Amino acid sequence: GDFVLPELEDVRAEAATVDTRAVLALAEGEEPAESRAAVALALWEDRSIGTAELQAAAEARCGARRPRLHTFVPLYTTNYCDSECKMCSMRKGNHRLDRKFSGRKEITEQLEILYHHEGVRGVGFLTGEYEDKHTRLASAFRIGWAIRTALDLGFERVYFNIGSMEQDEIDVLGEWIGREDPVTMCVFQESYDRETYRRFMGKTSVGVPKADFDRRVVSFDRWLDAGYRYVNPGVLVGLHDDLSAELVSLVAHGDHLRSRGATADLSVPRMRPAMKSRDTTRVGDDDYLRLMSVVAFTCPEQRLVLTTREPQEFQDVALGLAGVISPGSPDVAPYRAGCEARNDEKSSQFLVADLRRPRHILGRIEASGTPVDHFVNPAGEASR
């Protein structure tokens, strides 16, 4: 019943049998005869199909999706963490980080800034992941409170990204919300390759919570078992060298979730500068656009999430592939009325490339011709 990692050799064999040109010729709303993972791999490896042509096909295939875009802004509620992810500044061993924690007042103030000054109706709550059961339950409780508070304020969509979750931890968070509430669980697997995963997230049975690959990857299944709906798997582009392996796994994971009746967003964030203990792979724009294209094409009902990790120039090229645009900063309580968000190296998870205010970024997107759901431009008669 839980997600099972696909056999990469089995998918490769199936991918050899798909007609990539026939696939591209499919009408919007038509599904290939082969599995999505196989089709994605075949499109990826068929270099006779240009990335530019693949991207155009993807944007066309996802064209009828409504709304075209919606948005949420991240709010890191703390930068404490018990884990040791080597590509992340929040790793416990990073003694150089200035550890911060948002209380009731600060979280509420941040929500109110986002709602009224940035004009957004989507928010995401983030924390580190913690080792001992009590801290995990207490974190779930606090984030559950934040989610409930955001919804009561009028936020129309709430994401959370607080590490893997077991059944009792979901129980604690769930007492704050209803089964039909617009709440999305985010748990990026980072890498579906167990060896690369261990290299960056560490070895198990030593008080490093995220090292447990299996607890993490079945978190969505526990979520769905509890009766919820919205999920957000992800791959961190730059960890594993073989992107074809990761796209097969991610598409397979999304496909599993879809089969369970889940609504899934798909995240493929690319690496950003941080206080790392191990360097990573720089993935070029072309490979990355090709990755986004095959995933978006093969999973047309599952929105890709694009964030301000990426510079303005890249957003301009890739926005057509996304279903969710998410501007913001991975610093703790970084927002302030009329000011750009803080992205201090001393306390942030990583350094983002685009620090322009969410309402400017989202305003320019709307001005360019694409409406953004869960964004209410604080302009004209809608201004205070």
Cα angle 53-318-51, degrees, rounded to a multiple of 5: 25
CA separation for the pair 214, 205 (Å, rounded): 13
Told to check if 372 binds Na ion by CB under 5 A, we report: yes
Residues 129-148 binding ligand SF4 (CB under 6 A) are 129
As measured in angstroms, the least distance from the Cβ of 166 to ligand TRP is 21
As measured in angstroms, the least distance from the Cβ of 90 to ligand SF4 is 4
Contact partners, residue 153, CB within 8 Å, separation at least 6: 111, 112, 115
Written as one letter, the residue type at 55 is Q
- Tokens representing 379 are 């302009």
Q: For residue 241, what are the CA distances in angstroms to 13, 147, 238, 307, 367?
A: 21, 36, 7, 22, 38
Told to check if 347 binds ligand TRP by CB under 6 A, we report: no
Told to check if 161 binds ligand TRP by CB under 6 A, we report: yes
349 assigned ligand-binding residue: yes
Report the sign of the C-alpha dihedral through residues 232, 196, 40, 256, in that order: negative
Query: Which one among 137, 226, 283, 353 touches its own copies, defined by CB under 8 A?
Result: 137
372 binds, among Na ion, ligand SF4, its own copies, none (CB under 5 to 8 A by kind): Na ion
CA separation for the pair 160, 178 (Å, rounded): 15
Number of Cβ within 10 Å of residue 52's Cβ equals 13
The window from 40-48, 139-147, 256-264, 266-274 that contacts ligand SAH (CB under 6 A) reads 266-274
Told to check if 114 binds ligand TRP by CB under 6 A, we report: no
Told to check if 352 binds Na ion by CB under 5 A, we report: no
Residue 267 contacts residue 311 (beta carbons within 8 Å): no
| Residue number, nearest CB to ligand SF4 | 85
Q: Specify the 3-state DSSP secondary structure of 161.
A: strand
Told to check if 136 binds ligand SAH by CB under 6 A, we report: no
309 assigned ligand-binding residue: yes
Cα 130–chain centre separation: 20
The window from 50-58, 184-192, 293-301, 375-383 that contacts ligand SAH (CB under 6 A) reads 184-192
Told to check if 267 binds ligand TRP by CB under 6 A, we report: yes
121 binds, among Na ion, Br ion, ligand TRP, none (CB under 5 to 8 A by kind): Br ion
91 binds, among its own copies, ligand SAH, ligand SF4, none (CB under 5 to 8 A by kind): ligand SF4
| Beta-carbon-side half-sphere exposure of residue 364 (alpha carbons within 13 Å) | 11
Told to check if 144 binds its own copies by CB under 8 A, we report: yes
Q: Specify the 3-state DSSP secondary structure of 366.
A: helix
Q: For residue 185, what are the CA distances in angstroms to 151, 304, 312?
A: 15, 15, 27
112 assigned ligand-binding residue: yes
15 binds, among ligand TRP, ligand SF4, Na ion, none (CB under 5 to 8 A by kind): none
- Annotate 289-332 with three-state secondary structure: HHHHHHHHHHCCCCCEEEECCCCHHHHHHHHHHCCEEECCCCCE
Helix axes 243-259, 285-298, angle to 10 degrees: 20
270 assigned ligand-binding residue: no
Binding positions:
76, 81, 85, 87-88, 112, 116, 190, 210, 216, 272, 309, 349
Binding positions for S-adenosyl-L-homocysteine:
76, 87, 190, 210, 216, 272, 309, 349
Interface contacts to ligand SAH, rule CB under 6 A: 81, 87-88, 126, 128-129, 161, 163, 187-188, 190, 210, 234, 236, 269, 271-272, 274, 309, 349-350
Binding positions for Zn(2+):
112, 116
Interface contacts to its own copies, rule CB under 8 A: 78, 80, 82, 99, 101, 103-105, 128, 130, 132-135, 137-139, 141-142, 144-145, 168, 171-172, 175-176
